[PDB]
């Protein structure tokens, strides 16, 4: 099997050399070297991320598409950054305006062709593909425009592949932009609509998770994508690797998604305990379900603790009893049979590998369905409104070729969005 | 990618030699052009040893631009891109703009567009002007005029010193303020504001100096500035385009103004003390006693800010230090906007002057913005301009000029919008 | 013998949580000059960012139905709640 | 079986660094090592104080509640300090006012939660939980307020498993606070009516004990503290042992309380003779019975001969005769029949465990019911009227959101458990 | 865990200097601020390598603030925490408090906001002024009163040297001290009080010395204080915090006033003879003639005592030295009051100044202490009072200062009802 990474815009971007940083040193693959696996199993399998040319250049099969150059420019300038072949960077050296409507009506429209080209020659690699991963931020041009564009388009091309989406959503508390709910409603939008599997992580709920979580003091970005990464790990190439049971974004889709909305998730990753001291070991598993379903934890903003879930993935990597596993999983149901939801007699989806991550002894990715998202597209709804009541800084929009009735659109859709998440909460 | 300069205006000039100044000492370019991409948005790699500089310099007197190719720095600039109107400045819009303004533009614009050529992709042409000033009003007022057309399709940042607010100089400056901003308002893409005045509090109150020569406000600027492009086209944590500024600091059309404030001012002579936390800084902020600018936050809510930091910084220490601003509420931010904070976060500290009387610490806050604040500063400039006019003062210096009764009353007319506008994108939910 | 009534002791509760049972805290005159600074401190206790936007700018009713503005409206062993923008929800807050 | 050490306060804290340091040498549990045990047998029981993570690190599974920083990070920063894991650490960098009310009703009222989180981590833990030992003292705020609060939360939360307390009784002659009676009337109260197994200790009953009994001439407070820590050791820990005839918590409950107050012991240790000199041995076992029955002797304040006594456990801890010990016992129970009460054919409990006190051949810990403990909740009793009449130092307590009707409530329950007690000496 | 302190009034100023100076003198860091958390809660860690004052300096004539800045600790504190009002002090409370010392505050003020800041989680302000002075009574007035209110939450102790029973100086000193009674008394937490006279009792009869400067008083009190804060926000085998002492120290709202005792007063030269048993300084804190304070027990019974030991004691020494007292009976404390005896133990012996004239013994008793003697000391001290009000004498000096006759008769029945709560909280059971 097979994906494809999509780094939309720079965010999406910044977050691709962290998601490549992790994977390949997860696959033993050097900046341009080959495969220093310490092992041999970190290989029957890679295909899923990179392409066989030389013999010790296995490339990944990722795309990079900004309308910013000193982005690119700053990932293919520093550490793994010279691994891309070039032919991989979609650049649109234009001005990547901040404005959704810049980067998927009138700047990235243009560019998109020149990018499709591309989806086109590394689908067509080989053997069979599965999906594409898409890294992006919902609060900008290149990001949620132009981003939430190369998905409408690849949707198009391949309905059958799949499409996991990581969605950088709009943090609550400080956003990083002021039109913010516009980039976002927007692409939430063309989200719910093509995309079917969604992570959305909050900067802010990273930061909480590393500064509580990981006594860390100074979290730089570097580290929230680094965390981000670790958790898109374990979701995908994870599942691509043997296990008494394991899954594929398929399971993890045909066990997640109730209704075709899409849904979006909420991913958490397992042993998330400080360096030194905290390296207490208690991971026998019970400490893996008690971190996971725990509140804080989730890359989510909102609280599980906030609202049912109507499907859960402990998508462990490491080895257990499936006994200890299937068990666990039980009373975790049953003590909170509050908020799980009840039509779904097993809401949760038990998979699990065999190998870790590298250097730890067991992890688990969670990649929750809760119905608690609901309180967040509300939030990012609630904003727009507040806003476009007086068309705010609509005209960067309009002004460059938009809809008075497409904002229109989008938050509607996305706020219906909002109301039928609540349908199954009760 | 890259950002010309026009420096308009012996001020915009003085200035300009400063910003230019603080530029090439932090970026190992000795004035002789030489250094032993990156930064390439504003210099130009001309023959196999040297660095151009990537603007230009406007005044009517040559007394100004003179100095320039008099003092180390005169190997920096090409013979050429220092225009001047041997001629007459004359401190009236009028007349710069009209009249004798006219007679150069051509040739100034001919730079801007074989300077504009040169390159690769650009973004814009940050512009240093004076408000209040004949070469410094006037003409810009055509020359950003004559760019909206020429180039619609990029940035017109345009960095101005507008009247001081009890210190002004010429009798008229209004006259020629008033001006400046009705013709530049329907061409610019996000003015800075770097108030002369309140600029000297500072010296006065956070670095302790009543020797302020203007060589130092313009060190200021000259930092505030460095802040903007030299940094930002400079790679970092968080890059942030020009475009990004206007994108996510201009709410309206309106060439809208926003104001420059920088965190660490502290006199050489303290560069011992322990420095400044990453939450002093931050809330140094948000005190109307450090922002170059007579526009205390009076009521003024802010509507979007643009943090750009530089330094040893932590993307949590910000996004944290700005999370507890967020919830000061008094200081209170616009309704219609949620969340309007674009963190800009830089590598390299700031650098400072080699002996001047700037501290020089290890990270650095120059954070701009779009206050309703403004809405006195215009207002409180804009009467100024009625009493004179309410008695035509000095009219007969502008009509003799080639202007009319309807140049200034029609331009009056348009400001008063501009009070209006300031007051309805706030005060009100 | 000086006169003196003491603080007041209320629940505070955060509109919109049908989860946590609020914080309780006391208030007086030699400990918030004004409401504004009691809801300064508000903020700092029942600090959040999901049931309370900027964590606490105002103080309603157990109800809802009206917020407090002096110290005077609060009594002894009251029930409030915190509020900021988000509208009332009516949840078993004293259930 | 297990339980669960709470170390309320300073004090309460102070001895948990005694009565740790002890124990743990009756484990052979070094600051961070693990089981050197000189024996084998140091090790089949520890469970009842440790936890299982690394392999050579058992760590103590008690409770540090405190709202003055500098204790625990004194007590963290000395000798065992650092085996606790940091969770273990409930601090409160509030002003640890020393007002019962501050600490349990507004500064303590507030840090608990974050308490009983941790109280349910360690209940939780593993096996089967048989209750939690709590130290403190009843003369100040982060001990008789916030630790008396800790427990009336934890007997809601295991009404089952046992709650044993080690009290700080506000010593006679001098008291080394002003409020004492205050702060203590006002735990007394709270205790009376949660924890079933107080054993009450008085710093200058111990001096006395310590400074006669022990040539000591230079009693520092790790003294006292340790001569404490060693009879709680006998109590616990030693019936967690082996023995002909052994008991645990429970027998040591159910044959010591007859009726529910909860009533208060007196612990007493056996060999308690000066080091070099009298290393007299007269140990036989008549002599440990000699010295625990004594007067002088009784932690207390108190002498039992001052008033009958309900029950008594010897419970011994060194290789003896069944016989020499049940015998003694008797002749003990007819030469004082005058003091001990009639109702209770055999109010003496003997419990006789087999290894001893590390480095002793012989030890029996005394615990006593005596109704003469009623001559000291008279006395604090006293001084809360004596200057509750005027109110003293009460702003202090009210300005905290306390009642006039609650300092009223305490006395009169404590005042009355008073009366109770004498119920039985007639 | 901090005490942030402000000292008032020269006078509060200069044993300021003092009780700043044995401070580092006992924590190895130079004047230079370097030494080569534990005492955190009174020294910040500018970074960086130095240490600088966690306190502020308030006064109305430059002379003696300006002395600091001249003398070895010039390199301490931040040039900044030094505030001076150029204008004048006058020895009249209505002038410091109201029309002048008013101008300054709020900049005073803004530094115990901006010191108050930086910390983490502090506990209060110990505050040193001179009860009966302009710049020390008036203004704090008003500081703790401004503070009362911005911090409510926290422990407002303040160190007072209040008016020498016979041996005043300012003619007026009454004026000054019935009003800086009433209007900090309803502020502060605890106030503490050390008589300027009966300390030179100490320097005459227990040093022997009829040569005492100031700079000795100062070097006394500089001691006491330093076993208040320094040391017991010092780890030890009993800590007390400074909420502990209001709490153990004030039976009653009123800012209750304990008064300072030291126990082992003897002078270097003595410095050899064999040192004093436990028995004897406990014993040393029952006599009338050691206590910093013109108060004799004259008939106070005592209504708590906070004995803080430091250095080589063993607490069953002290929980039977303070037995023995409890049972002199000649001792009397109040009858609401079983057990009034707080002991505070630390470890850290004092630190006498290296040859001043303090003896360095290796353990001491700085017991302080509500006794219902000072009914006495504020009675006298009222009286004084009446007979110049009784005649107005310097009165116009205050009115024609922003006061009247209200302040004065209404400050005077304020202090009325602390002759009269002195009076009932003992004599009476
Ligand atoms: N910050 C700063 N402000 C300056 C400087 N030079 C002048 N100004 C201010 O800019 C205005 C002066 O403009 P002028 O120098 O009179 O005129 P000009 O704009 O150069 O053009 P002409 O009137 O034709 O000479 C006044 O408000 C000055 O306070 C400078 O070097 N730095
Ligand atoms: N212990 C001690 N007492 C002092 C010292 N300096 C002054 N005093 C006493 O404090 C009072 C003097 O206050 P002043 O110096 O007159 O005034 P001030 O309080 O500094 O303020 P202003 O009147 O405005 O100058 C007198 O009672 C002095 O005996 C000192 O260094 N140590
Ligand atoms: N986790 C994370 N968020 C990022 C990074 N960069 C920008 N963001 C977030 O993305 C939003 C801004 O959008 P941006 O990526 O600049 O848009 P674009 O570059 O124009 O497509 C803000 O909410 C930021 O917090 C990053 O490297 N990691
Ligand atoms: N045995 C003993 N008593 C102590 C110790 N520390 C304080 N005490 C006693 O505890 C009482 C004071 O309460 P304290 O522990 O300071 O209260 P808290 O710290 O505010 O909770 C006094 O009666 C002391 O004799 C100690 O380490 N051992």
């Known amino acids: 099997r097979e994906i494809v990474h999509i780094q939309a815009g720079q965010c999406g971007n910044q977050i691709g050399a962290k998601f490549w940083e992790v994977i390949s040193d997860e696959h033993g693959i050097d900046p341009t070297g080959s495969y220093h696996g310490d092992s041999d199993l970190q290989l029957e399998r890679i295909n899923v991320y990179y392409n066989e040319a030389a013999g010790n250049k296995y490339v990944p099969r990722a795309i990079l598409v900004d309308l910013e150059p000193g982005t690119m420019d700053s990932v293919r300038s520093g550490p793994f950054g010279q691994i891309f072949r070039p032919d991989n960077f979609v650049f649109g050296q234009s001005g990547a305006g901040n404005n959704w409507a810049k980067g998927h009506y009138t700047e990235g429209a243009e560019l998109v062709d020149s990018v499709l080209d591309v989806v086109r020659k590394e689908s067509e690699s080989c053997d069979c593909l599965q999906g594409f991963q898409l890294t992006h931020s919902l609060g900008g041009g290149t990001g949620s425009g132009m981003g939430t564009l190369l998905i409408s388009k690849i949707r198009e091309e391949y309905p059958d592949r799949i499409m996991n989406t990581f969605s950088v959503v709009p943090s609550p508390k400080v956003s990083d932009t002021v039109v913010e709910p516009y980039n976002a409603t927007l692409s939430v939008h063309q989200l719910v609509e093509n995309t079917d599997e969604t992570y959305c992580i909050d900067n802010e709920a990273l930061y909480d998770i590393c500064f509580r979580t990981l006594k860390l003091t100074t979290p730089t970005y570097g580290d929230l994508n680094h965390l981000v990464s670790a958790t898109m790990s374990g979701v995908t190439t994870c599942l691509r690797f043997p296990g008494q049971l394991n899954a594929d974004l398929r399971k993890l889709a045909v066990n997640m998604v109730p209704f075709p909305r899409l849904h979006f998730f909420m991913p958490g990753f397992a042993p998330l305990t400080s360096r030194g001291s905290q390296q207490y070991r208690a991971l026998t598993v019970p400490e893996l379900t008690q971190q996971m379903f725990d509140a804080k934890n989730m890359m989510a903003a909102c609280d599980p603790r906030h609202g049912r879930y109507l499907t859960v993935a402990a998508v462990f990597r490491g080895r257990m009893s499936m006994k200890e596993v299937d068990e666990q999983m039980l009373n975790v149901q049953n003590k909170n049979s509050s908020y799980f939801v009840e039509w779904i007699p097993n809401n949760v989806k038990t998979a699990v590998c065999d190998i870790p991550p590298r250097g730890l002894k067991m992890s688990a990715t969670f990649i929750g369905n809760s119905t608690a998202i609901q309180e967040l597209f509300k939030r990012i709804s609630e904003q727009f409104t507040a806003m476009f009541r007086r068309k705010a800084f609509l005209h960067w929009y309009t002004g460059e070729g938009m809809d008075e009735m497409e904002f229109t659109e989008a938050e509607s859709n996305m706020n219906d969005l909002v109301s039928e998440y609540q349908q199954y909460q009760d | 990618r890259e950002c010309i300069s026009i420096h308009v205006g012996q001020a915009g000039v003085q200035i300009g030699n400063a910003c230019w100044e603080l530029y090439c000492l932090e970026h190992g370019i000795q004035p002789d052009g030489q250094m032993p991409d990156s930064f390439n948005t504003f210099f130009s790699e001309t023959g196999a040893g040297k660095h151009v500089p990537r603007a230009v310099f406007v005044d009517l007197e040559p007394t100004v631009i003179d100095e320039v190719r008099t003092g180390t720095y005169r190997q920096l600039f090409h013979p050429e891109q220092l225009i001047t109107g041997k001629e007459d400045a004359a401190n009236n819009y009028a007349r710069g703009h009209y009249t004798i303004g006219k007679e150069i533009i051509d040739l100034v614009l001919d730079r801007i567009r074989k300077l504009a050529d040169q390159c690769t992709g650009l973004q814009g042409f940050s512009v240093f002007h004076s408000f209040g000033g004949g070469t410094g009003s006037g003409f810009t007022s055509l020359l950003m005029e004559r760019l909206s057309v020429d180039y619609g399709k990029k940035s017109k940042l345009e960095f101005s010193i507008y009247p001081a607010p009890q210190v002004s100089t010429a009798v008229v400056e209004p006259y020629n303020s008033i001006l400046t901003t009705h013709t530049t308002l329907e061409h610019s893409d996000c003015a800075f504001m770097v108030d002369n005045e309140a600029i000297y509090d500072i010296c006065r109150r956070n670095l302790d100096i009543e020797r302020p020569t203007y060589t130092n406000l313009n060190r200021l600027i000259g930092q505030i500035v460095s802040s903007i492009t030299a940094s930002l086209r400079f790679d970092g944590a968080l890059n942030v385009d020009l475009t990004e500024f206007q994108t996510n600091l201009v709410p309206y059309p309106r060439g809208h103004f926003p104001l420059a404030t920088y965190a660490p001012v502290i006199s050489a002579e303290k560069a011992y003390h322990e420095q400044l936390s990453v939450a002093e800084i931050t809330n140094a902020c948000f005190e109307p006693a450090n922002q170059m600018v007579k526009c205390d936050p009076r009521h003024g809510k802010y509507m979007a800010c643009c943090l750009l930091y530089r330094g040893d910084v932590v993307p949590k220490d910000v996004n944290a230090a700005i999370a507890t601003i967020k919830t000061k509420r008094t200081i209170q931010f616009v309704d219609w906007c949620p969340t309007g904070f674009k963190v800009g976060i830089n590598y390299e500290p700031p650098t400072v002057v080699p002996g001047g009387d700037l501290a020089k610490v290890q990270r650095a806050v120059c954070m701009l913005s779009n206050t309703t604040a403004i809405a006195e500063a215009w207002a409180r400039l804009d009467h100024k301009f009625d009493l004179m006019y309410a008695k035509r003062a000095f009219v007969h210096w502008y009509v003799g000029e080639g202007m009319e009764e309807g140049e200034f009353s029609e331009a009056r007319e348009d400001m008063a919008a501009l009070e209006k506008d300031y007051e309805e994108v706030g005060v009100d939910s | ?95």
Chains 1, 4 share one sequence.
């Not at chain 3, 600074?37 to 009206?66: C, E, F, H, K, M």
């Not at chain 3, 900021?84 to 078993?92: G, P, Q």
């Open chain 3, 1 to 95: 013998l000086s006169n003196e009534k003491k603080a007041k002791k209320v629940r505070f509760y955060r509109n919109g949580d049908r989860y946590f049972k609020g914080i309780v805290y006391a208030v007086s005159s030699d400990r918030f000059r004004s409401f504004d600074a009691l809801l300064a401190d508000l903020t700092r206790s029942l600090s959040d960012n999901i049931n309370l936007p900027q964590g606490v700018r105002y103080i309603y009713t157990i109800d809802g139905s009206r917020k407090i503005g002096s110290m005077d409206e609060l009594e002894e062993g009251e029930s409030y709640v915190c509020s900021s923008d988000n509208f009332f929800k009516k949840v078993e807050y004293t259930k």
